[PDB]
RNA sequence: AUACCCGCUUAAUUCAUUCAGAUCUGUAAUAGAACUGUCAUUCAACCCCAAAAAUCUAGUGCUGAUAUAACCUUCACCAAUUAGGUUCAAAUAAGUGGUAAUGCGGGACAAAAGACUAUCGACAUUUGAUACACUAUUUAUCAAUGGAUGUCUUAUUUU
DNA sequence: GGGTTGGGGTTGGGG
């Protein structure tokens, strides 16, 4: 009954299929359909991840960043699982997030999981 | 001892170890990279199960690595108002569904139940990454300072 | 820029310290469990009355100024500061403690804090003060802390004094502890 | 309401209002379905359940019912459960189990020492947790007042809210505090400045709070300038000649003192004694002092400043201030109430409060004027008298405030100095010359330093432990002379009871022996005390702080009241204790034993004072016996033979040293008399001694040899002596040291015994003498009723003890004691009513209003006296001797004693003739009591005839007495001879 | 010359508060409350003028007082007929007390 | 009101001058002549024992049936004593001790009424209500006072 | 920048 949810990125294409993971990022193209937007993950720019949102989006109740989970469709689409949008004042250090992910998961979360 | 930051995966491992190994001349304690009895965790507060007969709210929780459930309790009036003290920051949103990223404390004891201690929400995932990297460094230094003490 | 340390390192240094050694460090911890069974404030003149002569009925007459004065009550609080590494019994000065009480409630002014607390305790407002103290637990902050290995009446001991209290900052405290982790891995 | 009894603590508790549920543990568990009648648990745990007592403000038994089972209760550690329960409290404070706690978020460690914790964690509590379960255990601990039994008459409050804060408390200030006049600050000045001109260090060579704006303050500044100029421009030497002149032989006194200082060697003592007496005669009359002060006042302060009429009234009040004795002070209102706010013209009517509320206006002006007068007296009168006069008293006399001139006292001090012929941060001391007689015997003190005071206290508790140890050792088998340190009636009672036993069995015909010792404090040898200290009958000691609360002396109304009391009237005390590797009772209770009537209580605090070895005491002995820099003004020298006076432990040290000596001496003598037949007893204070024996020859030989061996080491004394006649070697010893005197009815340090009947009296004196030297009076400031009830309970000196527990003595002696102490009681009480009756206000807007009449005097004093008489007729819990069961002689006896009270009151109200108008009413109440008791004495005869129980030894005996000597008319006409 | 009249007094006003309000000025007087109105007599015209200058407000330049928190204007220029009526009423009180004492002597 | 009270006044000029020296004049050996510095932190309650606290409590008991042995009053004030008398509720005094400062003048004839409704429904006399207030205090009204109050004089004499 | 905490009550005996 336990479902894993790792953290991956573009540099991990191979993890998109059949692997329910955790996706984070700031909605760059704030699409108003409230069901499908374009976001940037933990980097500066050009992390153009398609986010097939939950059919409702609190587009103006919170800030830019949104987190969801699920499987990643090959065109970098994200199937909706669970929205956890934040009300952010201090934005991400995407450098810090990337170091955490691709360092812990590289060796120590690997040494853990 | 001191409170340690943990996650669902490691606590599941520790619970399974407590199940299997009797750990003679020990017990009433969970030992990992050393030993511990209390934890701090940042995860998502899960579905609120309504259990009321002797115990109270069965608060579920889940991280990127697992899904666990803890308890709160009162008899008549002991933990209704403090239960609300914990629970306003969930209830007063009125639009968040009932799943938000949150940091809380738990008390470990050698018994198949986990008691919730204190709770608050997490508004920036900077703090979530903080909690994860802190717990990572904490186990690293704990293991390699107890073994290098 | 400044530097940051751990509670365990600070306690280790204090244990390996001698009389008259005061060293200041910065940590990312929180405050919890304020002790209140002892008195919560003291008296001092406007001119910092070193020994204000005592007179009953709450009559104030300083000796460092030697005139009738408006009293200066300074609230002294003791609590425990903790982090993911350790915990220390600490003593908070009136100024920073009143800043914290302003944070929890802006209704009371900074200097008004001691007077308001004294009024509450003499009047019977105790439960509200206890609840407010409860509200201050687990308050993540940046702490500037110094320590002294002095001796208190022919008995050596270790005491601590928190000087500057600052709000936490994930963006750089995470960087601090991450680079510490990187150093540890490299070693 | 019959009387007090042993106790029934469940009734005692449930009989009080605030807590509405009271029970024991066992029946509470039965009610809450946690246990059943078949719950045949361990027997000891069963008595634990029965003796355990619980209470609560609410009947939350419903909250503690079963309501379900869910039987898991698996393995939670009792320590963890208690930790969780403690965490449940959070910010709350002052609960028992709270003590010794470090609440750290959700974690605690254990600190200090808590014997109550060892009482916890028991198998009893383990079973209790098995019964309650998690939540029930935690909430019962947090809520109920848990009381368990450890001792026959020892019960613990191991849990619940601490009884302290429940029993410690006892827009506002309708009258303000009106700061005090520090009359104490007039004592013991040793300062001379070459001239009058009292204080150049004072304001002569500030601010204001609530004056009339500040213009009145400016006027005050102007008038202070006036008085400053007057003070600068007035000589005091001639005024001192006029009112407090020196003796005319002043220069001759100076010359003889100087010659004495030079060469008084060996031809001094008599002349020095006469000189001391003469210098003591240089006192100054209070009236002369008052006139001098009044002239001072007139020369400086404007009668317009003070108002003319208020000025005159204050001038009158000055004599009262001078007259009134030590440890007393007139409050500001004691003058203000006789001050007028309208005798001063320049008073500012700002805002016209007079036209808003003239009473508020007058109150404000009274506040202002009172502050001004406080300023005047504290900054003028007290400094002036302090610099110009030495204020002191006579130790053997008491609180009579004598005055003297500075040069005379300085010369006396020099004469004392010539009589001194006798490491660490040092705890320095200070000398104070104490007038005792036509001679002096000064005292010491320790001052000026917090650390010195604290270590002084440390000495206090460590030697208090030493005194406890020596007390127990003496009680089991006297290491001292045996029956020596009786500490206020213990050994005196045992002594008297045993001697009564032989008078019943052996020979009441006996022979007393007096004995005195001089300078016991200085008869101490350092080396030998250290040696006998190396005997070391106690090591490995430790301390525990005490929180006891038990058994006041007052009855409790039954559940037939016809109000709201709180669970107190078991007044607290405070003691320190000791412990080592010994019996577990001291480990548990932290208190050894104190006899009372059977109501338990015990509560302990947490603290860790460390004193295990006598080596630290040895260090303090090095502190004291070898180095001492006690300075009168600049002196460092000290007599080195003996423990210094003023030392807070010198009494116990002298007791221990004479224990050393009397060890050998008393061993010899007591064993001799044990062989002889043992009709002998002893008692010895610090320097006073009494002896008893029928065989005068044997006892007198004992006196000879004991004085021999005692004076074989340079210890002298001289005072009156015993009826024993010569034993010529005794006469040689008398010629050696002291004269001998003979007189029956051995008198004592404040008691005496008609040893023929062994009837022990205390003292009798005269009204004026009793007024002198001892009387101190309180002030009725919304405290009148409490002040007077407790102050007429000033039978709290000896007349509630020491004499109404002889266990055999006839009612003649009992009532003789009673009415003698009653006489003394009135002799000392009359100042109280005399003073406070002059302010008997029908206008008392609370006391007189509740009184409901303008004759406050009559009924209020009737109430207070009748209430005190009721108290003393209900205080005969001593009188279980003859009344405990007979069920009517209790009333007869207490009414008889009330009759004695009222007859004494009759005599002394005839003495108080000046209040006849309600003296008649008081006498009417008295005669009512008298004649109703005459009827009661008649009725008791029929009651005895109709009742069957006999109790020959006590009940029938006292009935025989009261029938043969108290038959209606007899009672009066035999007890009046017994009065005589 | 020694009379003032307080008008527009709030309904149900007792004499104690109005005499206290006049006592705020601090000058002795005698009051009579009718219907509403309160006619006040002072001892002499000097104190009457003193009361006039004390009760006048320069903001509205008129004689005003505070009654139960409200502002009430008073008039010192008493009409001649009303003053005559008050003098007759006061002399009626005088001779009423005189006749009461007279008849009280008369029963004996 | 009677032995006193009240309104008016008071009456003095080195009793003394320590210790720390410092000018040390006097220096034989010290007077003296002084300057400063003062309790200066005033230091504080000296301790030890011991016996009690209604708590913010108003317990509310013995209903008046007796003392014929209790009670009464005098001296400038108070206290002890003495006697005397009563014996039902009041008339006697003396002694002794202690305490009360001083000069002048008013209280003044041994006191109540007379009449004036004189002064007053504006007067003051309480009670109980309100607003205040408030531990040592009075306010304006309400009722009732009702004569609240002052004015003449007490014996043309033994009235 | 302080921090066990100083004073109320004064009744018999001792010193
Ligand atoms: Zn100041």
Nearest nucleotide to the CA of D386, by C1', is F39
Sign of CA dihedral C119, C124, C126, C132: negative
Contacts of C175 in chain A (CB under 8 A): 93, 96
| Chain B residues 78-97 with a CB less than 8 Å from chain A | 95
Strands (E), D129-200: 148-151, 154-156
Q: DSSP secondary-structure letter at D312?
A: H
Half-sphere exposure of D338 (CA within 13 A, CB side): 15
The answer to whether the CB atoms of C175 and A93 lie below 8 A apart is yes
Q: What is the Cα–Cα distance from B31 to B26, expressed in whole angstroms?
A: 10
- CB under 8 Å to D305, separation ≥6 — which residues? D223, D344
Strands (E), D599-650: none
CA of C43 to the centre of ligand 1 (A): 11
- Among D579, D499, D484, D569, smallest CA distance to D539 is for D579
What tokens were used for D551? 């058994």
Q: Are D116 and D591 in contact (CB under 8 A)?
A: no
> Which of A90, A99, A100 is facing C171, going by the closest CB pair?
A90
Q: For residue D899, how far is the Cα from the chain centroid?
A: 29
Helices D123-132, D78-89: axis angle to 10 degrees equals: 70
Q: Are B96 and B117 in contact (CB under 8 A)?
A: no
What tokens were used for D276? 């001391």
CA of D178 to the centre of ligand 1 (A): 23
SS3 D394: coil
SS3 B121: strand
> Which of D74, D88, D106 is facing B38, going by the closest CB pair?
D106
Q: What is the Cα–Cα distance from D465 to D457, expressed in whole angstroms?
A: 12
Q: Are C77 and C63 in contact (CB under 8 A)?
A: no
- Among D891, D886, D787, D775, smallest CA distance to D839 is for D787
SS3 C110: coil
Write the Ramachandran bin of D255: left for phi over 0, alpha for psi from -120 to 50, otherwise beta: alpha
What dihedral do alpha carbons C151, C154, C155, C157 form, nearest 10°? 0
Strands (E), C62-158: 72-75, 77-82, 87-92, 139-148
- Among C2, C8, C1, smallest CA distance to C29 is for C8
- CB under 8 Å to D707, separation ≥6 — which residues? D733
The residues with which D653 forms a beta bridge, in sequence order, are: none
Q: For residue D191, how far is the Cα from the chain centroid?
A: 34
Burial class of residue B3, CB neighbours in 10 A (0-12, 13-18, 19+) = buried
- Among C30, C26, C29, C28, smallest CA distance to C2 is for C26
* CATH classification number, D183-246+284-404, choose in 1.10.10.10, 3.20.20.70, 1.10.132.70, 3.10.180.10: 1.10.132.70
What dihedral do alpha carbons A101, A103, A109, B1 form, nearest 10°? -100
Which residue's entry shows tokens 């007035």? D234
Residue A76 belongs to some domain of the structure: yes
Given 3-state DSSP classes, what are the helix, strand and coil percentages for chain E, each rounded to the nearest 5?
Answer: 45, 25, 30
Q: Are D143 and B75 in contact (CB under 8 A)?
A: no
Q: What is the Cα–Cα distance from E36 to D947, expressed in whole angstroms?
A: 84
Cα E63–Cα E68–Cα E71 angle in degrees, nearest 5: 30
In strand G, which positions have an atom below 7 A from any protein CB?
A: 1-15
SS3 D223: helix
Q: What is the Cα–Cα distance from D361 to D354, expressed in whole angstroms?
A: 5
Q: Are A55 and A72 in contact (CB under 8 A)?
A: no
Q: For residue B44, how far is the Cα from the chain centroid?
A: 11
Q: What is the Cα–Cα distance from C41 to C117, expressed in whole angstroms?
A: 9
Helices D916-946, D856-874: axis angle to 10 degrees equals: 30
Half-sphere exposure of D491 (CA within 13 A, CB side): 20
| Closest Cα in chain C, distance from residue D172 (Å) | 11
The residues with which D404 forms a beta bridge, in sequence order, are: D390
Write the Ramachandran bin of B110: left for phi over 0, alpha for psi from -120 to 50, otherwise beta: beta
Residue A26 belongs to some domain of the structure: yes
Question: What domain count does chain B have?
Answer: 1
- H helix intervals, D18-77: 25-31, 43-51
Q: What is the Cα–Cα distance from D498 to D678, expressed in whole angstroms?
A: 12
Q: What is the Cα–Cα distance from D595 to D597, expressed in whole angstroms?
A: 7
Residue A3 belongs to some domain of the structure: no
CA of C64 to the centre of ligand 1 (A): 5
Cβ density class C10-26: b for 16+ within 10 Å, e for less: bbeebeebeeeeeeebb
What tokens were used for B41? 């965790």
- Among D73, D92, D104, smallest CA distance to D141 is for D92
Half-sphere exposure of D56 (CA within 13 A, CB side): 18
Strands (E), D125-170: 148-151, 154-156
Breaks (C-N over 2.5 A) in chain B follow: none
- CB under 8 Å to D273, separation ≥6 — which residues? D438, D439
Q: Are D327 and D182 in contact (CB under 8 A)?
A: no
Where residue A36 sits, what CATH number does that domain have?
2.40.50.140
Q: What is the Cα–Cα distance from D317 to D377, expressed in whole angstroms?
A: 12
Cα D968–Cα D971–Cα D977 angle in degrees, nearest 5: 150
Q: What is the Cα–Cα distance from D233 to D217, expressed in whole angstroms?
A: 24
How do the domains of chain D map onto residue ranges? 1-170+543-607, 183-246+284-404, 454-541+642-761, 764-979
How do the domains of chain C map onto residue ranges? 7-40+76-186, 41-75
Containing structural domain, residue A48:
11-113
- CB under 8 Å to C128, separation ≥6 — which residues? C120
In CATH terms, are C7-40+76-186 and C41-75 the same topology?
Answer: no
Q: For residue D931, how far is the Cα from the chain centroid?
A: 38
- CB under 8 Å to D499, separation ≥6 — which residues? D510, D681, D692, D758
Q: What is the Cα–Cα distance from C25 to C5, expressed in whole angstroms?
A: 6
SS3 D651: helix
Nearest nucleotide to the CA of D654, by C1', is G15
Cα C68–Cα C74–Cα C78 angle in degrees, nearest 5: 155
SS3 D350: helix
Helices D286-300, D215-232: axis angle to 10 degrees equals: 120
Which residue's entry shows tokens 């029970």? D23
Sign of CA dihedral B121, B127, B129, B132: negative
Residue D590: CB atoms within 10 Å: 25
The residues with which A49 forms a beta bridge, in sequence order, are: A39
Quick check: E26 contacting D, CB < 8 Å?
yes
Contacts of D450 in chain C (CB under 8 A): none
The H-or-E segment that residue A68 falls in is strand A65-70
Q: What is the Cα–Cα distance from D508 to D500, expressed in whole angstroms?
A: 8
Half-sphere exposure of D909 (CA within 13 A, CB side): 22
- Among D866, D797, D791, D800, smallest CA distance to D829 is for D791
- CB under 8 Å to D385, separation ≥6 — which residues? D186, D293, D391
d(CA E94, C1' F145) / Å: 16
Q: How many residues does chain A have?
A: 113
- Among D570, D488, D555, smallest CA distance to D877 is for D555
Burial class of residue D918, CB neighbours in 10 A (0-12, 13-18, 19+) = middle
> Rounded to the nearest 5°, which phi and psi values hold at B103?
-115, 135
* CATH classification number, D454-541+642-761, choose in 3.10.580.10, 3.40.50.300, 3.20.20.70, 3.30.70.2630: 3.30.70.2630
- H helix intervals, D58-101: 78-89
Write the Ramachandran bin of A49: left for phi over 0, alpha for psi from -120 to 50, otherwise beta: beta
Q: Are strands C159-167 and C87-92 parallel, antiparallel or unpaired?
A: parallel
Helices D696-711, D650-676: axis angle to 10 degrees equals: 140
Q: How many residues does chain E have?
A: 108
Q: Are D431 and D635 in contact (CB under 8 A)?
A: yes
CATH architecture of C7-40+76-186: Beta Barrel (2.40)
The residues with which D429 forms a beta bridge, in sequence order, are: D446
Quick check: E28 contacting D, CB < 8 Å?
no
> Rounded to the nearest 5°, which phi and psi values hold at E56?
-80, 140
Where residue B54 sits, what CATH number does that domain have?
2.40.50.140
CA of D124 to the centre of ligand 1 (A): 60
Kindly report the CATH class assigned to C41-75: mainly beta
Burial class of residue A49, CB neighbours in 10 A (0-12, 13-18, 19+) = buried
- Among C68, C46, C65, C40, smallest CA distance to C55 is for C68
Q: What is the Cα–Cα distance from D542 to D580, expressed in whole angstroms?
A: 7
What tokens were used for C134? 């409860």
Q: Are D321 and D330 in contact (CB under 8 A)?
A: yes
Cα distances (Å, whole numbers) of residue D838 to D35, D596, D850, D915: 67, 42, 20, 11
Which residue's entry shows tokens 């000398």? D431
What tokens were used for D977? 């001879």
Which residue's entry shows tokens 């039994």? D149
Contacts of C178 in chain A (CB under 8 A): 96, 99-100
Q: Are strands B4-5 and B38-49 parallel, antiparallel or unpaired?
A: parallel
Q: Are C19 and C158 in contact (CB under 8 A)?
A: no
Q: What is the largest CA-CA distance in chain A?
A: 42
Q: What is the Cα–Cα distance from D681 to D746, expressed in whole angstroms?
A: 14
Q: What is the Cα–Cα distance from D69 to D131, expressed in whole angstroms?
A: 11
What dihedral do alpha carbons B107, B110, B112, B113 form, nearest 10°? -20
Which chain residues have CB less than 5 Å from ligand 1, an ion? Answer: C 45, 47, 49, 62, 64-65
Asked if strand F contacts D185 at the CB level, meaning under 7 A, the answer is yes
Q: What is the Cα–Cα distance from D538 to D581, expressed in whole angstroms?
A: 10
SS3 D640: coil
Which residue's entry shows tokens 């027997």? D43
SS3 D741: coil
Q: How many residues does chain B have?
A: 149
Q: What is the Cα–Cα distance from D713 to B115, expressed in whole angstroms?
A: 78
Question: What domain count does chain A have?
Answer: 1
Q: What is the Cα–Cα distance from D470 to D656, expressed in whole angstroms?
A: 8
Q: What is the largest CA-CA distance in chain C?
A: 66
The residues with which D31 forms a beta bridge, in sequence order, are: none
Q: At how many Å resolution was this determined?
A: 4.8
Q: Are B39 and B105 in contact (CB under 8 A)?
A: yes
Q: Are D968 and D934 in contact (CB under 8 A)?
A: yes
Q: Are D162 and C39 in contact (CB under 8 A)?
A: no
């Amino acid at each position: 009954e336990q479902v894993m949810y790792p953290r991956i990125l573009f540099e991990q294409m191979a993890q998109f299929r059949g692997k329910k993971v955790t996706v984070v990022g700031n909605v760059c193209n704030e699409d108003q359909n409230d069901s499908l937007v374009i976001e940037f993950g933990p980097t500066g720019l050009n992390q153009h991840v398609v986010i097939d949102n939950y059919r409702r989006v609190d587009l103006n109740n919170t800030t830019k960043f949104v987190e969801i989970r699920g499987v990643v469709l090959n065109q970098n689409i994200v199937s909706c699982e669970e929205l956890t949008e934040f009300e952010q004042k201090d934005p991400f250090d995407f450098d810090t997030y990337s170091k955490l992910i691709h360092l812990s998961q590289s060796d120590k979360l690997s040494s853990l999981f | 001892q001191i409170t340690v930051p943990l996650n669902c995966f490691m606590i599941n491992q520790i619970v399974k170890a407590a199940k299997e190994n009797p750990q003679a001349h020990s017990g009433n304690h969970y030992e990992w990279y050393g030993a511990f009895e209390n934890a701090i965790i940042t995860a998502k507060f899960e579905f609120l199960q309504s259990i009321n007969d002797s115990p109270k709210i069965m608060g579920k929780l889940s991280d990127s690595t697992g899904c666990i459930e803890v308890v709160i309790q009162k008899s008549k009036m002991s933990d209704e108002l403090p239960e609300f003290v914990q629970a306003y920051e969930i209830e007063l949103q009125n639009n968040g569904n009932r799943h938000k990223y949150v940091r809380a404390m738990l008390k470990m004891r050698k018994n198949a139940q986990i008691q919730l201690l204190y709770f608050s929400i997490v508004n920036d995932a900077n703090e979530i990454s903080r909690h994860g990297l802190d717990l990572c460094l904490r186990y690293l230094q704990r293991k390699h300072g107890i073994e290098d003490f | 820029q400044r530097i940051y340390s751990s509670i365990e390192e600070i306690i280790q240094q204090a244990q390996a310290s001698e009389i008259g050694q005061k060293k200041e460090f910065y940590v990312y911890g929180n405050l919890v469990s304020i002790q209140m069974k002892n008195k919560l404030y003291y008296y001092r003149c406007t001119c910092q009355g070193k020994s204000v002569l005592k007179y009953h009925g709450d009559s104030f007459f300083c000796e460092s100024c030697q005139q009738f004065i408006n009293p200066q009550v300074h609230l002294m609080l003791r609590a425990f500061v903790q982090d993911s590494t350790g915990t220390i019994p600490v003593m908070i000065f009136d100024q920073q403690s009143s800043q914290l009480i302003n944070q929890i409630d802006p209704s009371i002014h900074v200097q008004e804090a001691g007077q308001y607390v004294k009024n509450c305790i003499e009047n019977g407002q105790e439960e509200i003060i206890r609840q407010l103290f409860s509200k201050l637990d687990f308050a993540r902050f940046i702490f500037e802390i110094q320590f002294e290995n002095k001796e208190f009446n022919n008995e050596q001991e270790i005491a601590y004094k928190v000087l500057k209290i600052e709000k936490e900052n994930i963006k750089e405290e995470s960087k601090y502890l991450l680079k510490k982790l990187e150093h540890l891995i490299n070693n | 309401q019959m009387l007090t009894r042993k106790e029934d603590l469940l009734t005692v508790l449930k009989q009080i209002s605030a807590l509405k549920y009271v029970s024991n543990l066992y029946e509470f568990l039965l009610a809450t379905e946690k246990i059943v009648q078949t719950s045949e648990l361990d027997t000891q745990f069963q008595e634990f359940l029965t003796t355990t007592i619980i209470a609560s403000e609410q009947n939350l038994v419903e909250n503690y019912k079963q309501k379900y089972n869910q039987p898991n209760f698996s393995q939670l550690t009792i320590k963890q459960v208690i930790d969780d329960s403690i965490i449940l409290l959070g910010n709350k404070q002052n609960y028992v189990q709270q003590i010794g706690t470090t609440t750290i978020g959700f974690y605690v460690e254990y600190e200090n020492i808590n014997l109550s914790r060892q009482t916890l964690y028991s198998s009893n509590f383990r079973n209790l947790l098995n019964i309650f379960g998690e939540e029930d255990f935690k909430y019962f601990l947090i809520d109920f007042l848990v009381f368990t039994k450890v001792e026959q008459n020892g019960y613990l409050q191991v849990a619940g809210v601490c009884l302290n804060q429940y029993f410690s408390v006892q827009k506002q200030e309708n009258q303000y505090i009106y700061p005090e006049i520090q009359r104490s600050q007039i004592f013991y000045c040793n300062h001379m400045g070459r001239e009058p001109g009292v204080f150049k260090s004072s304001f002569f060579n500030y601010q204001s709070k609530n004056f009339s704006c500040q213009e009145e303050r400016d006027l005050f500044l102007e008038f202070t300038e006036k008085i400053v100029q007057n003070f600068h421009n007035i000589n005091f030497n001639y005024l001192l000649k006029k009112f407090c002149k020196l003796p005319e032989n002043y220069q001759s006194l100076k010359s003889q003192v100087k010659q004495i200082v030079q060469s008084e060697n060996k031809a001094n003592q008599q002349s020095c004694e006469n000189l001391f007496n003469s210098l003591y005669d240089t006192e100054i009359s209070y009236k002369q002092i008052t006139n001098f002060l009044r002239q001072i006042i007139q020369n400086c302060v404007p009668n317009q400043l003070l108002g003319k009429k208020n000025f005159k009234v204050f001038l009158e009040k000055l004599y009262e201030f001078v007259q009134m004795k030590r440890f007393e002070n007139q409050k500001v209102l004691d003058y203000i109430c006789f001050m007028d706010v309208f005798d001063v013209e320049w008073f500012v009517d700002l805002k016209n409060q007079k036209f808003t509320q003239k009473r508020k206006y007058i109150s404000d002006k009274r506040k202002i004027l009172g502050d001004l007068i406080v300023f005047i007296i504290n900054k003028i009168v007290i400094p002036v008298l302090r610099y110009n006069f030495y204020i002191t008293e006579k130790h053997k006399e008491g609180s009579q405030i004598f005055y003297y001139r500075k040069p005379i006292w300085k010369l006396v001090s020099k004469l004392t100095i010539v009589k001194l012929e006798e490491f660490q941060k040092y705890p320095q001391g200070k000398l104070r010359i104490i007038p005792k007689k036509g001679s002096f015997r000064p005292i010491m003190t320790f001052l000026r330093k917090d650390k010195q005071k604290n270590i002084k206290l440390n000495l206090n508790q460590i030697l208090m432990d030493s005194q406890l140890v020596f007390r127990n050792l003496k009680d089991m088998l006297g290491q001292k002379i045996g029956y020596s340190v009786f500490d206020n009636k213990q050994i005196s009672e045992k002594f008297a009871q045993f001697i009564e036993k032989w008078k019943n069995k052996g020979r009441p015909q006996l022979y007393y022996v007096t004995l005195d010792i001089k300078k016991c404090y200085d008869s101490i040898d350092q080396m030998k005390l250290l040696n006998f200290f190396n005997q070391s009958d106690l090591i490995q000691d430790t301390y525990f702080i005490n929180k006891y609360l038990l058994f006041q002396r007052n009855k409790r109304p039954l559940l037939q009241i016809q109000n709201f009391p709180y669970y107190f009237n078991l007044k607290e005390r405070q003691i320190a204790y000791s412990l080592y590797d010994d019996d577990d009772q001291i480990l548990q209770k932290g208190f050894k034993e104190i006899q009372s009537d059977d109501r338990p209580f015990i509560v302990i605090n947490q603290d860790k004072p460390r004193c295990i070895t006598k080596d630290i005491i040895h260090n303090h002995l090095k502190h004291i016996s070898q180095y001492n820099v006690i300075s009168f003004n600049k002196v460092k020298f000290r007599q080195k033979r003996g423990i210094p006076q003023g030392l807070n432990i010198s009494g116990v040290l002298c007791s221990f040293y004479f224990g050393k000596l009397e060890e050998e001496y008393t061993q010899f003598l007591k064993n001799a008399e044990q062989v002889n037949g043992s009709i002998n007893l002893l008692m010895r204070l610090t320097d006073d001694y009494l002896f008893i024996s029928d065989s005068q020859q044997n006892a007198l030989n004992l006196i000879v040899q004991l004085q021999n061996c005692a004076n074989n080491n340079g210890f002298m004394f001289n005072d009156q002596k015993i009826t024993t006649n010569f034993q010529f070697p005794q006469e040689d010893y008398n010629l050696e040291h002291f004269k001998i005197s003979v007189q029956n009815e051995c008198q004592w340090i404040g008691k005496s015994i008609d040893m023929n009947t062994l009837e022990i009296k205390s003292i009798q004196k005269q009204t004026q003498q009793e007024i002198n030297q001892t009387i101190n009076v309180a002030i009725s400031i919304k405290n009148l009723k409490s002040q007077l009830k407790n102050k007429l309970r000033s039978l709290f000196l000896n007349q509630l003890i020491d004499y109404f527990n002889p266990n055999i003595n006839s009612f003649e002696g009992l009532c003789r004691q009673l009415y003698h102490h009653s006489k003394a009681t009135v002799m000392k009480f009359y100042p109280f009513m005399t003073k406070l009756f002059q302010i008997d206000l029908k206008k008392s807007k609370q006391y007189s209003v509740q009184y409901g009449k303008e004759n406050t005097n009559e009924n209020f004093l009737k109430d207070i006296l009748y209430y005190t008489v009721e108290d003393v007729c209900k205080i005969l819990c001593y009188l279980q001797f003859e009344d405990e069961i007979n069920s009517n002689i209790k009333e007869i006896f207490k009414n008889l004693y009330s009759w004695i009270m009222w007859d004494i009151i009759v005599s002394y109200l005839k003495k108080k003739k000046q209040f006849k108008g309600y003296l008649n009413k008081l006498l009417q109440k008295i005669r009512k009591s008298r004649f109703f008791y005459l009827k009661e004495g008649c009725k008791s005869l029929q009651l005895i005839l109709s009742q069957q129980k006999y109790q020959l030894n006590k009940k029938e005996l006292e009935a025989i007495e009261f029938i043969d000597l108290n038959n209606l008319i007899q009672d009066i006409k035999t007890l009046i001879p017994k009065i005589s | 010359n020694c009379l003032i009249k307080i008008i527009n007094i709030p309904q149900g006003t007792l004499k104690a508060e109005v005499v206290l309000a006049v006592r705020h000025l601090g000058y002795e007087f005698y009051c009579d409350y009718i219907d509403g109105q309160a006619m006040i007599r002072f001892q002499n015209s000097d104190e009457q003028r003193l009361a006039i200058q004390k009760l006048l407000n320069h903001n509205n330049n008129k004689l005003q007082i505070e009654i139960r928190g409200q502002i009430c204007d008073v008039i010192s220029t008493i009409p001649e007929d009303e003053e005559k009526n008050y003098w007759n009423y006061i002399k009626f009180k005088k001779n009423e007390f005189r006749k009461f004492f007279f008849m009280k002597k008369q029963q004996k």
